[PDB]
């Protein structure tokens, strides 16, 4: 399966099924598992809208007046990809899907027909379009569960329904708006068809994703990783033990990873090069792509480094993250404790000596939460500024920040080494202002500040 032999094809012994059953045991108090009603919901729903998008390309294929030869057959489906699509959908977060639609069909006829159509649906609410963006999409609340969907018009004159995007030939002449809502998917479907037992590998997931979430060390955009990233590390993981069950899976994972010599890229499959001058991680030939300390690349073409936003101290934090987790897996699996030892959180806010405290506020809830977004995605600023200070060895943000007239106000803890700092903190704030206002994404009164604080002096800076 794998770009290597794996390292060892032995099977479970009738010991690892109990310890995998007690696994799954201790997970669900957890909310990892979606409850059947939900999902059988979610289900519903996706059907609903599936058929809501056939309804759509069926009304544009006449209105286009194509043939009946064509029209009845023309197709036109949803594609659900990311958690999802894994079996390993995060309760509270969204659907992720991708409409595909046959050559016919215009980008301009998503957001406007087919947009209009989902805005006069009784279960439709909070309809919102942001074509904008980097990838172009329609976010809507559908019947309480929130939905995402990006559009990609494909050079086909119907979309059969067993299209299988992973198809390199699809990228051929497409826009590079249709390309990049597409990558999703086929991510997504590589990673599936890349590991030996579905089932196994979606049990490991579930418990890696809580592990890192309950440790702190769950997020892309704050240098971590993210769920695609976190699927991969597992997969991988799956083609070198392609019999073991979740159980030894969740142990060889940390095995695996406390031992890996980075920045040696993790890889599902060769990569093949395609012309398309689409951007392509491969350090061989892009010097840039060397820099990369902890290199996690995507399986589908053009492959892509899902972690190039990693810096030193969030990779030392990560490295000793899976050493613990190594050493709890191997009590476990002597029975010198259990599983909900590997999910217990350290006290963040008390592992480290020194921290910095970062206060976002604004006038109103719907600023705190624009405010407190794009502050989040400056953050790795600050982490940077700290790193090339002599005096600091790593920063480490908790990823999971939290509440504090009416007072709309919101906080990082930020846990830092020493191998005083007000200049780069002052820089990091003075930066943030300036970036958000420049462009024009600034209202009067939101506010950041930060403060350095010793372990000891947080506690009147919490609860
Ligand atoms: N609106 C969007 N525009 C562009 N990319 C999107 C959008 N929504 C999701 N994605 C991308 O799709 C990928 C899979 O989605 P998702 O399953 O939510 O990812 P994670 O991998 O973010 O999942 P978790 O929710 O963290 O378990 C990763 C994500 O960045
Ligand atoms: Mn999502
Ligand atoms: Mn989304
Ligand atoms: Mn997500």
Known sequence: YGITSPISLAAPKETDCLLTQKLVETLKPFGVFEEEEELQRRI???????????????????????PQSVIENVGGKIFTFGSYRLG????????????????????SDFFTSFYDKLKLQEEVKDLRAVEEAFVPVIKLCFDGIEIDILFARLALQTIPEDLDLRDDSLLKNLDIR????????????????????????????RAIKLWAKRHNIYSNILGFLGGVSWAMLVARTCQLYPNAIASTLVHKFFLVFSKWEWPNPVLLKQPEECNLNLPVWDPRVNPSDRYHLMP??????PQQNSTYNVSVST?????????????????????????????????FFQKYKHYIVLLASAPTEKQRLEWVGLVESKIRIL????????????????????????????????????????????????????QAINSKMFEVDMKIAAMHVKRKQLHQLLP
């Open 315 to 347: 990779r030392m934090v990560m490295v000793e993250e899976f050493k613990q987790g190594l050493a709890i897996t191997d009590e476990i699996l002597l029975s010198k404790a259990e599983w909900s030892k590997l999910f217990e959180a350290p006290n």
């Open 44 to 66: 519903l729903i996706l059907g609903k809208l599936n058929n809501l998008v056939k309804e759509w390309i069926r009304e544009i294929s006449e209105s286009k007046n194509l």
């Open 383 to 434: 982490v940077g500024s700290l790193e090339k200070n002599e005096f600091i060895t790593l920063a480490h943000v908790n990823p999971q920040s939290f509440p504090a007239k009416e007072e709309f106000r919101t906080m990082w803890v930020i846990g830092l080494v020493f191998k005083d700092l007000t200049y780069d903190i002052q820089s990091f704030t003075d930066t943030v202002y300036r």
């Open 178 to 205: 249709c390309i990049r809502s597409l990558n999703g998917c086929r991510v997504t479907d590589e990673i599936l068809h890349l590991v030996p037992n579905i089932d196994n590998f979606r049990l490991t997931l």
């Open 88 to 107: 390993v959908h995060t309760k509270g977060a969204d659907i992720d899907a991708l409409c595909v639609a046959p050559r016919h069909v215009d980008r």
């Open 296 to 301: 996690i690349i995507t399986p589908a073409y």
